[PDB]
Amino acid sequence: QGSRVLHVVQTLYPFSSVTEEELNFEKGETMEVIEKPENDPEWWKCKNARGQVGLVPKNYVVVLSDGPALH
Amino acid sequence: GSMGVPICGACRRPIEGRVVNAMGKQWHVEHFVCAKCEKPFLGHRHYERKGLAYCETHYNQLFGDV
Ligand SMILES: [Zn+2]
Ligand SMILES: [Zn+2]
Structure with missing residues (x-):
């Protein structure tokens, strides 16, 4: 109900986040960016296609799919 | 086969x-x-401030080294 190809993201480093809303993921993890609020830090609510969710520095991953696709 | 492509921040x-x-x-x-109005410098000059781009006027409106 929330995984359309809009902004898929491939990890660049095996980060480690283990909290309530933290995302732990090994490099090579397709994460489905559920939401991208600012809040203050710059983290994003991204689900891991591995089927998990947690906040993660939106700078630790690159974006492949995009909405504005002009030409 | 090392990387070889810049990535727009x-x-x-x-x-x-x-x-x-x-x-x-x-x-x-x-x-x-610019980090205040979003005016792209396709072929124009830009101005930086506190680590952020700013048009010639916004940069200065923001500071202007003064
Ligand atoms: Zn760009
Ligand atoms: Zn400006």
């Missing part, structure tokens, strides 16, 4: 034409804009 997308090195990063000559 604006959309985090692999750049592939004319790059703009700012903020110690790379930016699509089209996405590199």
Whole structure:
């Protein structure tokens, strides 16, 4: 109900986040960016296609799919 | 087979034409804009402040080295 190809993201480093809303993921993890609020830090609510969710520095991953696709 | 493509810090997308090195990063000559009005310097001059781009007037409106 929330995984359309809009902004898929491939990890660049095996980060480690283990909290309530933290995302732990090994490099090579397709994460489905559920939401991208600012809040203050710059983290994003991204689900891991591995089927998990947690906040993660939106700078630790690159974006492949995009909405504005002009030409 | 080492990497070989810049990535616009604006959309985090692999750049592939004319790059703009700012903020110690790379930016699509089209996405590199002022950090106050978003005016791209396709072929114009930009101004940096506190590590953020600013048009000639916004930069100065923001500071202007004074
Ligand atoms: Zn860009
Ligand atoms: Zn400006």
